[PDB]
Ligand binder design. Structure first.
Ligand SMILES: *[C@H](CS(=O)(=O)c1ccccc1)[C@H](CCc1ccccc1)NC(=O)[C@H](Cc1ccccc1)NC(=O)N1CCOCC1
Length: 215
C-alpha cells in the first residue's frame, strides 16, 4: 500500500451531495462507491441516482434507513445490475418527500455484477482502497454531529448508524488519517468531508466495509 491515496485527485469522486431531511445515507454510500468503481473500470465519471434506491429498493426503507449490503443486493437481483444516472432520476427526497418508484426509460449510467465484503482490518482496507477505489463504509456518526474540522482521534465508537464513502488516506501525518465523503452537503465539515485517525478503528470504520464489483 502507498503512504497516501486520494481518489478525488484521481478522478473517481463526484461532488459532495446532500441527503437533506431523509435518512438515506445508506443510498449515498452505495452510489458513491458505484460511481468510483465505474470510473476506475475505465468509464467517464458520472453522478448516479440515490433517488433510485430511496424510492425503488424494496429491501431498504427509503428515508427510514437501510444497509449498503441490501442496496447492492437489490441492484443486482432486482434491477438487473443497473444504476440510473442522477440526471435521469434526480434527488427529490431532501425535504422528506417520498414519491413512488418511477422506473421507466431511465438512462443507465452504470452496471454492477456483485459486491464484496472487506475484512475488519485497517491495513487490508487501505491496500484494497489504494488498488481499487472508494469503498462503502459504515460508522458510528455520533461524533460527526459536532464535527467542525481537523482529524478526529477520540471518535465515539459504539454502534454503526451511518453509511459514508471512504475516498483516501494519508499516513504522512501526525496522526495518519482516513478521508471520508459525507452526504450532508459541501457546507459540513471540510468541504463535505471528514478526516478521522487511521489505525485505531475510529468510529467503528473497519466494521462494515464493502464494494460493488463492475464486470
Ligand atoms: C443515515 C445516517 S444519518 O446521517 O441520517 C444519521 C441520522 C441520525 C443519527 C446519525 C446519523 C440513516 C439514518 C436513519 C434514520 C432515519 C430516520 C431518523 C433517524 C435515523 N442510517 C441508516 O440508514 C443506517 C445505516 C447503516 C449502514 C450500515 C451499517 C449500519 C447502519 N441503517 C439503518 O438505520 N438501518 C438498517 C438496518 O435496518 C434498520 C435500520
Amino acid at each position: 500500500a502507498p503512504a497516501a491515496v486520494d481518489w478525488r485527485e484521481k478522478g473517481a469522486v463526484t461532488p459532495v451531495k446532500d441527503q437533506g431531511q431523509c435518512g438515506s445515507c445508506w443510498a449515498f454510500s452505495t452510489i458513491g462507491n458505484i460511481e468510483g468503481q465505474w470510473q476506475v473500470a475505465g468509464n467517464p465519471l458520472v453522478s448516479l441516482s440515490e433517488q433510485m434506491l430511496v424510492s425503488c429498493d424494496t429491501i431498504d426503507f427509503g428515508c427510514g434507513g437501510g444497509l449498503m449490503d441490501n442496496a447492492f443486493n437489490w441492484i443486482v437481483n432486482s434491477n438487473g445490475g443497473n444504476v440510473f444516472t442522477e440526471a435521469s432520476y434526480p434527488y427529490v427526497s431532501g425535504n422528506g418527500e417520498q414519491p413512488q418508484c418511477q422506473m421507466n426509460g431511465h438512462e443507465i449510467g452504470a452496471a454492477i455484477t456483485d459486491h464484496v465484503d472487506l475484512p475488519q482490518d485497517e491495513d487490508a482496507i487501505a491496500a484494497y482502497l489504494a488498488e481499487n477505489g472508494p469503498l462503502a463504509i459504515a460508522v458510528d456518526a455520533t461524533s460527526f454531529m459536532d464535527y467542525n474540522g481537523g482529524i478526529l482521534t477520540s471518535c465515539t465508537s459504539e454502534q454503526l448508524d451511518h453509511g459514508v464513502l471512504l475516498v483516501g488516506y494519508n499516513d504522512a501525518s501526525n496522526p495518519p488519517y482516513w478521508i471520508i465523503k459525507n452526504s450532508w452537503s459541501n457546507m459540513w465539515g471540510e468541504d463535505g468531508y471528514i478526516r478521522i485517525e487511521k489505525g485505531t478503528n475510529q468510529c467503528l470504520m473497519n466494521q462494515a466495509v464493502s464494494s460493488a464489483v463492475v464486470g
